[PDB]
Subunit: 604 residues, 2 copies
């Protein structure tokens, strides 16, 4: 009985402007209703109804025009796939060929599945637009105490082509018949199981077992944290240090914070209307939810706390303390490379495939998902540097003869060899090479080659930073020279990233901006406070991340160690607030070509 | 798409036998389908269709007959309330009177709300019976590759009165119009808000915030429980005892186990179809779920663990250890008597009202809810005895001069005065007096006066136990005499309760047991293993609860008796839990015979 909310959750976000304006009409009715000349009123509503029915005529015209355009495109795509399949069967029947033709079959199958989803989306369009007309017209007659709404509906909407046409139904039946008599080789149970569209978007809930587990893992994590504070304030001794430890376990804290903050992004994208399932090309009918990410965050959270607490205590006296941390990372590695069909095997298979393509950048094309991860792995380098220290620490600074040799020179945590500089230039190198590939593939030097410059600036800042320090460590006479050259590149990079991420990424500061001062014309998120507040945060922390990478090759005192351990967490909160406005921008480009399905092509 | 599961969740459990048999029909179609005599098959399906369409004719006849009966009752109830309201308005307009007439208005309002719910239930009946006919007939034509199903539907079900009648709609509109023009004094927004029926039964879910909180409270409690074991094995000392402690905190463990096991009952009753909302008379459109009980169990669980862990440790050195336990029970008491409109205020208001009526038994009538609680409070007496010891302990054995005087003679935990006997005969006395009232009100000595006998037997067993233990305590020559008289009453009670609850409560061992040997003719729960297994448990633990009330009279001098009591109080709870299933089920099978899916609300003259 709450249609407003029903339509607000059952609308294709890309076509949000082709759907009847229910709330505006309600405002109109309750406006003319709350305000009246209480002959004066007789002529007053003789003018309000004119406007009301006038607006209704325009809205019905829009739905009929939008409906006609989509049906034409549907007939075209149908003819397109029909020929490809006929040609494919003609080629296979007329005929390395098997493997390519196998994909050819797989390509044709994804094409017909994607086409069916589009026909269902168009059917649900007409169904929810007719329900809105009837429910609002009843509110009009019920508010104006008249019978004109009934007259209007029976003579206009009830005859409207958007509500009278009967070709989408035939097209849907034609496709399912072809998919069953051509691809499935005769099985409607398999064909329908493939072409059937379940509830999608923000109109489908999650299992209560997922909500329960999510909450359970969280509650254990909260208690195992208060314990680590007290135990860290009592059982620990001052005779030994806590830095080799803070160094290895700091990495795990960042990865868990990433998965937790990433689930809060999936939630905001879903409730705002940003179709991240089309931007990242994820199965439209089978995809994970914010709850599944919150669940994996809690699981690895408890695993981390128990390992560190077993290090503060001595649960076992036959087990060397330098095995708890090794088992934790060994476990996390297996949970991601499990060759069994369990624990989100399909979701993990996607991540394992993407990572490979993003670590072989120059040999593969770049899609939003591929480049987006490399920008995610460009804010998760502290994890790579922590892993770096751990490897050398257990190889050069670890006394296995001493069972308690895990927690006690520093060459493993220093860029004495540049290992903490080249490793710091791994994620930037991936994005630099991925950009050049895009340029070669697009033949456009803007923005493919201008952006490849934003990634190079880091190489210089990291290099000069490591050189000035080493020369100064040898007391050479090139200490101030490198120091000045270094600080120069630092400020250059800090601004070549802030501008490109507040202009070429978010897309704010638009010539076409009316009331949203310094903001794009159309903003998806609800409040304008979010955009203005995030702009301040990106600036404040864009000049505090170039310093956290220049202290990887400089801060002799443990003071610099505190700085690094206090910044790695804040950098994560920057990629988190930057994951909102980046995806939103990409969505506002699909809401212009009205693209609610992907464009799947077949192989010749 | 899954109609079978849509029917079995959207069916009024009382009328479950008036609804089309969808699964049987599917079995028939897929049976004749899996078994094809591959002329032979031409005549084979010429005989299968005959049977299939024959069964369809009978089912449609049943739905039309059941539908006709309910509509007649609806017209009568409508005329009944109509006259009462007319008379009520005529009396008020024609006229202590204000407060009785206020109730009179409230009585008329609940009557029209309950009537509306009945009309909606009857509308949903016709709607789900026509959907089943169409969905099965399509499966028949789709399985037999014929068009007979379509012909059958258009010429029979499409014309059937259960699908053609249009009077329920008029009745529903008539009632809402009367409730708005008579009671609300003109406001359809208030009238509809009162007479509107939301999703009810096993077809409505719970908020994910409830599932999350439930899980969160559980996780903290589990960790706080592993911490009590390790702390109880390290920080604790042997110089002092742990019995005054086990005595006070044992009571809280039982109450939390009750609320947790009770939520698992609400779950089983809802998924089996036992309408506990009609048996207990709870708002049909606003009632708590198993999740809300699991949530309160976890909350009080953490509160208990933290209090006992603060006693093993010394979180504060200015706070005497004998205040953690006092704050816990003080808090639980407030959470139940909160005068604010928060934390289930409505649900708590019902429990507070029922408890009062069940503690003033002789002055009020007895309903399933009232008598059922007194039987719930008859298995929660260890909590009363623990509360008893604690009070005397903090009054006669507590050294406040010693800040650490909470954990260290025993006269507070002994029946030296009979306090552990009269207190042990409080819940049985309530049930005894409630039964006699029923007899006076029913004038029937069976089963009202035979039942009052099962409750008296306890009075004797506890008494003689004390006589033998107290005479023996003064080494009198009447030690063996009382001991023999005592053991006699013990076995008498152990069997006068097992039989009554195996034949007069559960209702098993029926002349009409058929395939269900030693079980009633119709069993609601899915497996027959549950009934047989529970019978064994009620016996094994019906002869182990009479002993846990005979060790409350200076009998087991050694701490072994203390161990016995602390190990039985938990098992007794698991008996009332397995007895809460078959008792409510029995009451339901009595409503599934008169087809009563709404309560009968009367008005005041
Ligand atoms: C999922 C639900 C929740 C799971 C919870 C898991 C258990 C957590 C238990 C935490 C208990 C800590 C606080 C203990 C309070 C009471 C005891 C106390 O205060 O004394 C400290 C106690 C005894 O000390 P002591 O006798 O000196 O120990 C000798 C060991 N050689 O010290 C002890 O001996 C207590 C040792 C507790 C160790 C708990 C941490 C995990 C232990 C096993 C290793 C698991 C992690 C493995 C990591 C691999 C990588 C993932
Ligand atoms: C190699 C080391 C590099 C250093 C960093 C550590 C490794 C990377 C850590 C982050 C991993 C990626 C997390 C986010 C990726 C997903 C992004 C997204 O929004 O996509 C969601 C989507 C779920 O829907 P999906 O099932 O994929 O739908 C189509 C399926 N065909 O797809 C997904 O959800 C895909 C992701 C699967 C579910 C989450 C996986 C959690 C485990 C990640 C590995 C953690 C351990 C790394 C190694 C040890 C490090 C100490
Ligand atoms: C809801 C989410 C979860 C909530 C968790 C709440 C906190 C739980 C913390 C449990 C910690 C116990 C184990 C501690 C492990 C590390 C320290 C250790 O092993 O040593 C014991 C430690 C120090 O002992 P010590 O220094 O002798 O104390 C002096 C006091 N005069 O001993 C201590 O000093 C530790 C004391 C811990 C006390 C925790 C229990 C609650 C304390 C406040 C009272 C709350 C309950 C109030 C009850 C009222 C009725 C409801
Ligand atoms: C006086 C002391 C005697 C010794 C024992 C302790 C007190 C009694 C403990 C048990 C309390 C009753 C628990 C079960 C009662 C409910 C039974 C049931 O299935 O009914 C469910 C129903 C919920 O639906 P409802 O909202 O009532 O629908 C109509 C509303 N008009 O109605 C309800 O849910 C009603 C119950 C409200 C919700 C649960 C209340 C939990 C708190 C109970 C008190 C606990 C503390 C007692 C005092 C301290 C003891 C240490
Ligand atoms: O009963 P429904 O068919 O579901 O219709 C209801 C109902 O309208 P009707 O009484 O005309 O049926 C509500 O009105 P009241 O019953 O409370 O008088 C109305 O609320 P409004 O009067 O405020 O419009 C509500 O709509 P909503 O909940 O959005 O306010 C609307 O449900 P629909 O929106 O689905 O028509
Ligand atoms: O698509 P629907 O209208 O929701 O109907 C489906 C569908 O039947 P139709 O194809 O005739 O529509 C299923 O059959 P397939 O598509 O898989 O061939 C059928 O399953 P069965 O063939 O096994 O009967 C299923 O019913 P169910 O899920 O109970 O098996 C039934 O949905 P309904 O039960 O709601 O008619
Ligand atoms: C000051 C020195 C050391 C470094 C200079 C690099 C960056 C700090 C700044 C300087 C000028 C900026 C550029 C000025 C103008 C433009 C064009 C502007 O064009 C668009 O809006 C393109 C939109 C589209 O392609 O969709 C995008 C941002 C960009 C490249 C800016 C990106 C960031 C730049 C390169
Ligand atoms: C064993 C000695 C020490 C005590 C005797 C009392 C109980 C142990 C037993 C003896 C005979 C039993 C009765 C034998 C037969 C019946 C009739 C039987 O009839 C019904 O089914 C009544 C149903 C109804 O009234 O609704 C119900 C149980 C009852 C009363 C039994 C209840 C339990 C009784 C009283
Ligand atoms: C490293 C730590 C691991 C912890 C490991 C646990 C991570 C989750 C912590 C709590 C937040 C998620 C669970 C909270 C509530 C969810 O049930 C709802 C479901 O949607 P609904 O409210 O519309 O039914 N989710 C939300 O409301 C949105 C997400 C809430 C985010 C809260 C931000 C703090
Ligand atoms: C004193 C202790 C306090 C603990 C305090 C926590 C008490 C709850 C413990 C766990 C059981 C309840 C929560 C488990 C799952 C629920 O989400 C589902 C919801 O129904 P669904 O599965 O159909 O979606 N409930 C059930 O499946 C039925 C109840 C499960 C009972 C489990 C018995 C152990
Ligand atoms: C200087 C500091 C305080 C700036 C803080 C900026 C943070 C708090 C702002 C910037 C962007 C904001 C987010 C922008 C978008 C959404 C999606 C919306 O559906 C929920 C709120 C949420 C999730 C906002 C949360 C608060 C937010 C993260
Ligand atoms: C001797 C001992 C082992 C006997 C144990 C008896 C117990 C375990 C049996 C007896 C009655 C049984 C219950 C009977 C009814 C239901 C409702 C059903 O929907 C879920 C199972 C459930 C909840 C059963 C659980 C197991 C049960 C509690
Ligand atoms: C750097 C530390 C990060 C962890 C601390 C929390 C950071 C994320 C906070 C998100 C706040 C906004 C959440 C919106 C939720 C909602 O709208 O329901
Ligand atoms: C005496 C201790 C009692 C507590 C231990 C658990 C007792 C209840 C066990 C219930 C088991 C059956 C639960 C059925 C759940 C389901 O069917 O989904």
């Amino acid at each position: 009985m709450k249609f407003a909310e029903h339509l607000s959750a059952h609308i294709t976000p890309e076509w949000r402007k082709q759907y009847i304006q229910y709330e505006a009409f309600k405002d109109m009715l309750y406006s003319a209703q709350d305000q009246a000349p209480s002959d004066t009123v007789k002529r007053y509503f003789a003018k309000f109804e004119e406007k009301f029915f006038q607006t209704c005529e325009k809205e019905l015209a829009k739905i009929n025009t939008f409906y006609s355009e989509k049906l034409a495109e549907a007939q075209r795509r149908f003819a397109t796939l029909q020929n490809e399949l006929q040609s494919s069967l003609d080629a296979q029947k007329e005929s390395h060929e098997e493997r390519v033709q196998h994909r050819n079959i797989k390509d044709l199958k994804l094409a017909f599945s994607e086409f069916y989803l589009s026909l269902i989306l168009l059917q649900n369009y007409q169904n929810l637009n007719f329900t809105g007309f009837r429910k609002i017209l009843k509110k009009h007659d019920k508010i104006l105490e008249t019978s004109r709404g009934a007259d209007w509906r029976v003579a206009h909407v009830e005859v409207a082509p958007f509500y009278t046409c009967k070709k989408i139904n035939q097209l849907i039946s034609e496709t399912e018949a072809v998919v069953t008599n051509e691809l499935e080789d005769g099985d409607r149970q398999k064909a329908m199981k493939r072409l059937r569209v379940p509830p999608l978007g923000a109109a489908q809930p999650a299992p209560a077992w997922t909500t329960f587990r999510v909450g359970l893992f969280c509650g254990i994590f909260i208690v195992l944290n208060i314990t680590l504070v007290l135990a860290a304030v009592f059982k620990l001794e001052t005779d030994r240090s806590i830095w080799p430890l803070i160094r290895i376990y700091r990495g795990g804290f960042l990865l868990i914070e990433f998965l937790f903050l990433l689930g809060i992004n999936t939630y905001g994208w879903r409730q705002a209307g940003v179709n991240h399932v089309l931007i990242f090309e994820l199965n439209p009918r089978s995809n994970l939810s914010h709850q599944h990410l919150f669940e994996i965050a809690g699981f690895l959270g408890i695993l981390w706390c128990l390992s560190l607490l077993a290090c503060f205590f001595a649960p076992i006296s036959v087990i060397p303390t330098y095995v708890y941390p090794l088992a934790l990372y060994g476990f996390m590695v297996f949970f991601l490379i499990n060759p069994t069909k369990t624990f989100y095997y399909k979701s993990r298979f996607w991540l394992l495939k993407l990572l490979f393509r993003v670590f072989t950048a120059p040999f593969h094309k770049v899609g939003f998902a591929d480049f987006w991860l490399a920008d995610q792995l460009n804010s998760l380098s502290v994890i790579l540097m922590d892993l770096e220290y751990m490897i050398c620490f257990y190889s050069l600074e670890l006394k296995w003869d001493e069972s308690k040799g895990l927690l006690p020179s520093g060459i493993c945590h220093k860029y004495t060899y540049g290992v903490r500089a080249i490793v710091q230039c791994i994620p930037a190198w991936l994005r630099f090479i991925q950009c050049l590939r895009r340029y070669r593939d697009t033949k456009r030097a803007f923005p493919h080659l201008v952006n490849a410059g934003k990634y190079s600036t880091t190489f210089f800042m990291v290099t000069f930073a490591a050189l000035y320090s080493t020369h100064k460590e040898r007391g050479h006479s090139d200490t101030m020279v490198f120091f000045y050259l270094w600080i120069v590149f630092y400020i250059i990079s800090s601004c070549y990233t802030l501008i490109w991420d507040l202009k070429m990424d978010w897309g704010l500061f638009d010539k076409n901006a009316g009331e949203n001062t310094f903001l794009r014309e159309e903003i998806v998120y609800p409040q304008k406070a979010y955009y203005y507040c995030a702009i301040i945060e990106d600036v404040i922390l864009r000049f505090a991340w170039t310093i956290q990478i220049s202290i990887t090759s400089t801060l002799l005192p443990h003071s610099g160690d505190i700085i690094a351990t206090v910044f790695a967490p804040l950098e994560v909160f920057r990629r988190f607030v930057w994951n909102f406005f980046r995806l939103e921008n990409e969505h506002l480009n699909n809401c212009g070509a009205a693209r609610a399905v992907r464009d799947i092509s077949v192989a010749p």
